[PDB]
């Protein structure tokens, strides 16, 4: 376990655990090494082995088959008081929160490419039976050479279901008004709300709401110049009534979403 990887410096820590940069010695592959304390684990799941693992491990295995816009789980290990997760590490990389901090409001062409890739990654999770429950710019990595976005941190996720959720541990300022008001939500429509928050974040340079009262107020003020078509998509994603929000298909068929850049064009035009 400590002989398969060379351990580098802390990339960060927080509600997810402590995450370290690392190198797989078998082939010098860059990895990220995440430690989670068993005592902090809320939801437990099981896999085919019937082995009892954190839910986060269950969800990562379900989305890690094949290529996608999700950071893949390469291995994991159980220790006395913790689990250790070996995850992909793009290099060079910046998370979308720091990217928006340094660059400000993104050009619509660039927000379109990013938002499209986030939609494809979330659709992939949903195809695999996985609800992420914490979509935000902090949980998105940008591979700056390939121009590809990658979703991280499934620590608040769940199996996707069609009945109501009554628990939530994701980020409150991205959570929907029906959660704020009634402590209930359905998975896809709550995901769509957080994608509205994220899109506003990208084209305006910060999220629209900080306080419960703004979240349930249903008023979107645009602080940057944003095209009418983009404003319409955002306001649709942020409809107060869940049933009034677009499906993923309606988002991707929206007129603002047409003629997206390829990932490599995005890197060359905006990131190199």
């Amino acid at each position: 376990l400590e002989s398969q990887y060379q351990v580098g410096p802390l990339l960060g820590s927080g509600g997810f655990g402590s995450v370290y940069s690392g190198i797989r010695v078998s082939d010098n592959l860059p990895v990220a090494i995440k430690h989670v304390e068993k005592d902090r684990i809320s939801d437990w799941g099981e896999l085919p082995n019937g082995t009892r693992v954190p839910m986060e491990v269950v969800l990562l295995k379900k989305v890690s088959s094949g290529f996608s816009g999700v950071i893949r789980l390469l291995d994991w290990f159980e220790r006395p008081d913790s689990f250790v997760l070996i995850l992909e590490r793009p290099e060079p990389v910046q998370d979308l929160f720091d990217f928006i901090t340094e660059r400000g409001a993104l050009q619509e062409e660039l927000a379109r490419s990013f938002f499209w890739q986030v939609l494809e990654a979330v659709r992939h999770c949903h195809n695999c039976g996985v609800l992420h429950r914490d979509i935000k710019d902090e949980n998105i990595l940008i591979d700056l050479n390939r121009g590809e976005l990658k979703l991280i941190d499934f620590g608040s996720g769940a199996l996707l279901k069609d009945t109501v959720y009554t628990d939530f541990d994701g980020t409150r300022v991205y959570s929907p008004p029906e959660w704020i008001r009634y402590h209930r939500y359905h998975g896809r429509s709550a995901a769509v709300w957080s994608l509205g928050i994220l899109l506003y974040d990208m084209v305006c340079g910060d999220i629209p709401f900080e306080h419960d009262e703004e979240i349930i107020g249903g008023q979107v003020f645009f602080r940057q110049r944003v095209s009418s078509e983009c404003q319409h998509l955002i306001r649709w994603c942020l409809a107060l009534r869940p049933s009034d929000r677009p499906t993923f298909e309606e988002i991707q068929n929206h007129p603002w979403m047409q003629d997206v850049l390829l990932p490599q064009e995005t890197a060359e035009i905006h990131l190199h």
């Binding site: 927080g14 509600g15 935000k136 608040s156 409150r172 300022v173 910060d206």
Partner: peptide, 9 residues
């Protein structure tokens, strides 16, 4: 205007 990270988990 103050932009900040927000915790979860």
């Amino acid at each position: 205007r103050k932009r900040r990270r927000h915790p979860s988990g």
